[PDB]
Symmetry: D2
Subunit: 317 residues, 4 copies
């Protein structure tokens, strides 16, 4: 019995009997993702090349304008803007949205998979909205998700009711629910990290990886996959199980990925799917941020694999 | 001045004044690639999920390539990753070319929306015998043309011939491949290495030492970055665009490698060499291996020439 | 400030605070119209012609299944089915839907514009659902509209708030609001009917057309257009003004077009746009039907032209 | 056995063993038709309406012009959109003259009526330097002609010496699929098509011919009437279902309404290759020798029996 993103979202709103802002917000995000997907696939490229005689900027403008027109937001934090964007009073609603409009776009020259990431928080006070209102821990997320522009376009959406996966049918521009209440494998067989920073790894990381290549219980060594695009590496981790690591290195002693609009939403998706997401010292979702662009080290995926890493990490004090 | 695949392919034929079969061959191939992309992007998936009340993708892709190539009247022997024996084209549809292809490489992991691709290489039939499986048992040196289509964030067709390597982007709005990169050449030296390091305990010692040099450079220069998508077309195109090295080498458990020579290694090796790169098995150029079985495997190290030459020095130092 | 069908529909529902079923119904119909459009434009025809080794039936199946899966319907009347379709109990909602899934498809061989027509009623009694629940006069319509699959695809939606026109952007599969609260011209310059049947015309019809071709005063004769597809002829009348006629004659005393899923929805659109729609004897929206497939004569369009028509019709009565 | 426009056009050239210019021209034209169809269907309209914060017939003209020029197969271009003929620059000059209407019917695209593209191709006949004179050839000299209809689906109809063939565009994969080979019009149809709002201006022959279609003297069934208002749509219906299409002269248009070079001549060429007829009343459309690239002409066309029945009434009226 077919179900679409629009129908799904409205039905969650009907059950909850909320004010409707979250529903309008997600519909706005839905439209922007379809417009980003069409541009990522290079629709209209022939006009650029003279048939009749930017991409990360356009994605940011799409998300920004669609979110403002939802009447559901008051503060917007993007990977693309230095300071938080404050919505003008006439378009202001109560939700705070942090997003990376096109993560991995550094390498789109080689047609690597890219994606969009978002996290939605509720503003708690009646004070005037400000950049501080986006300094909330991940635990406060109302909803989070990502769109992956891979071989097909897929939207993964996490709320309290669980994680659901929608495939974009480009023939009719509709998102079709194809995976309900997704749960990650208890243990995977793939680890994912840039091993080129091996000289700089913390000893816990170096040892954890060595166990993956030379298992102490005499099982099969893990395979390694590292696309270099965060959305792709995490989505594969969700689908197949396993582990993804972006630990601290010398260029990034607090890690490289951004807490507000990369780490937290992915951790929210992981935890809602029965996986885990840790910095090494605490859950990603428990870090209290002090800067909207602050970084975080991240280890996430199947819970047996993350717990195995935490045991190596704790053994190294 | 805008240029399309259809126009480009036709202009190459006019310059050469050939029989036209190769031009029809590429036209058929182009149509098949556009149909694979539309299905890889899941156009029509809503019908599978009951919007109005079914072949797996790699089966559909093989059916598209096989049917378009036969209908071109330009081929006589077809070798696919999907069939144990060669397909011999029936007489009324026969032309003079032998085509080896992998219709949807990487589809084992398409469940996670990883980049996938189509790879092809084209040879001319060499003997006066009846066409047979023997006719595809040619070395890569004999390739007339080869290339790949990558279904990544966008769809791109990379086509290599004697004139060099040219890259075409599919405009999905109008279904045209637009020429966007003419006469592409790989960087002389890169900063990325690509291989599955999870199988490190099985590596040949030469591979183990080379990987150590990329992570721990002896001259105190920058260590390389690593990428491994796991889809061959995706990793090779990244190597073509950014430079660096891709390895699927021999080890003691797999003395002839894992990848297939006729429809993976050779076409990728031809594109590399026409773009100024290198492709070796360790012992010889990939394009010089003479196959004995249409599905035989080969180890492959390819990419920027400086990175590959430095690899061969470690491999030789391990006499 | 950009506006989509999804956003429009949700905002009208928030203002009204209904139970949400009509919003889910309109969302389902939107998905059906996009799927019909993709099939009408022949996406996938290369597979029918053997690249890898009806249309109105498919349209009826898309509408039926999208409407049934909406949980908002209990009786469905389609031009394609002999009997009313009763929705199964677990999927039953409160709305009755009458529709023609692919109007004009008799002539789709020549790529003429075709269309979808629908009208939405609220079930009035608590009796078990039956064909009777669709036997309501057009005055009881909650909403109505049509989709035109012409050179572009457009959805025209009429409610109490008025008539709004949405253009389908096929690049992203979104309906974009392009014409808000549309109103027809007081008087037009085009008449539309099949003149090949002049030998069978009622005499009032013959004189009315003669005044349009040989005006008794010193004005310009009207132009004539007749596409043969009701949706296209009615949309042009809506946009340019004028008059559309499928009148009664002596061989067809009730006209040829069907009342429940052609005349009533189109008449409802006309009246919300400030136009008029008559059988000759009464307003189309006032006819009380006794059979779900009964025919009705319909003259509709600009009010001055319809009133001039009724003036000739009374002279011959 | 599946067949595409690209495959079709190349096989026709291989049979003929020409210089290749005509094949490159039709390949360009194909691309332009796919791009126009994409714009006619309003792909990207959400960006115009502010989703991120040329007129359709001008864009259509720039697509055909640019695609044709870059083909290296043309030397003179006549468009409905340009007052004077376009002379291709020398580095890109080929031997063909092309007459086209980039977006026929766009006056009424406001209501999403079917629109279309019409083209006609001649070989340049004289040896002088290219000029507007080179497009003043009679329709008889056409090498190829056709039209694209942007209707409920997009279809390209192409007529050559080998006949008339119809290709449906599959928008999923941007390919023209051959669906109707060697098309022939019915000997006699049952539909007539014209704007009857000009009845007060009709010459007596048109008035009598029409009167016969509504009140047949043989007490047989009256014809049905259809009039879309877009020439490509009305002519395509006439080709597919049979019948007759008329746009005769009126007081607003004493030399007719439609243009001879890029509307009448191509449609007449298609009619004649499908076994139909096309006349002005005085002569076959394809026999008129034009004197101006934008000159108008009256046209009666369609099933051969229906046109001859019209010519018989036309003769009866001196
Ligand atoms: N927050 C929140 C919230 C609260 N109430 C809602 N109620 C409905 O949507 N109700 S309704 O479907 O009966 C309806 C009635 C009138 C018009 C209408 O127009 C639409 F179909 F165009 C839909 C929706 N959201
Ligand atoms: N091998 C090979 C080969 C050799 N010669 C070729 N010659 C042409 O294509 N010539 S042509 O373009 O002048 C041409 C002439 C007649 C009809 C025609 O129909 C087409 F437009 F549809 C095209 C083509 N391929
Ligand atoms: N009839 C009717 C009717 C009445 N109230 C409605 N209220 C909302 O949609 N409220 S909400 O946006 O706060 C919301 C809260 C919780 C979950 C949620 O789902 C998410 F997917 F969007 C949306 C909707 N329909
Ligand atoms: N007029 C005309 C005319 C005359 N000769 C023609 N000859 C061919 O097309 N020959 S060929 O197909 O063997 C061929 C040979 C070399 C390269 C090639 O590259 C293409 F496949 F990329 C194709 C074509 N048109």
């Amino acid at each position: 019995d077919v179900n679409t993103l629009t129908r799904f979202v409205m039905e969650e709103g009907r059950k909850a009997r909320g004010t409707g802002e979250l529903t309008q917000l997600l519909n706005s995000l839905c439209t922007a993702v379809k417009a980003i997907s069409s541009a990522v696939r290079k629709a209209g490229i022939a006009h650029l090349y003279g048939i009749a005689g930017k991409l990360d900027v356009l994605s940011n403008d799409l998300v920004m304008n669609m979110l403002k027109s939802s009447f559901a937001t008051c503060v917007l934090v993007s990977e693309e803007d230095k300071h938080a964007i404050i919505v003008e009073p006439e378009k202001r609603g109560k939700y705070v949205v942090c997003f990376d409009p096109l993560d991995g776009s550094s390498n789109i020259d080689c047609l690597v998979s890219v994606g969009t990431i978002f996290g939605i928080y509720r503003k708690k006070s009646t004070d005037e909205p400000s950049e501080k209102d986006a300094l909330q821990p991940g635990r406060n997320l109302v909803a989070a998700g990502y769109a992956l522009y891979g071989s097909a376009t897929m939207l993964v959406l996490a709320m309290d009711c669980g994680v659901n996966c929608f495939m974009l049918d480009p023939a009719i521009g509709e998102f079709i629910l194809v995976d309900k209440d997704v749960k990650i494998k208890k243990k995977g067989k793939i680890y994912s990290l840039n091993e080129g920073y091996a000289k700089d790894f913390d000893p816990a990381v170096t040892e954890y990886i060595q166990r993956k290549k030379f298992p102490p219980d005499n099982s099969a060594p893990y395979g390694a996959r590292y696309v270099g695009s965060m959305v792709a590496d995490v989505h594969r981790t969700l689908v197949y199980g396993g582990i993804f690591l972006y630990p601290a290195n010398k260029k990034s002693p607090n890690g490289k990925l951004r807490l507000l609009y990369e780490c937290n939403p992915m951790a929210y998706v992981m935890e809602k799917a029965g996986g885990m997401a840790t910095t090494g010292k605490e859950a990603v979702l428990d870090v209290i941020p002090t800067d909207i662009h602050q970084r975080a080290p991240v280890i996430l995926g199947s819970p047996d694999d993350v717990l195995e890493f935490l045991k190596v990490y704790e053994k190294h004090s």
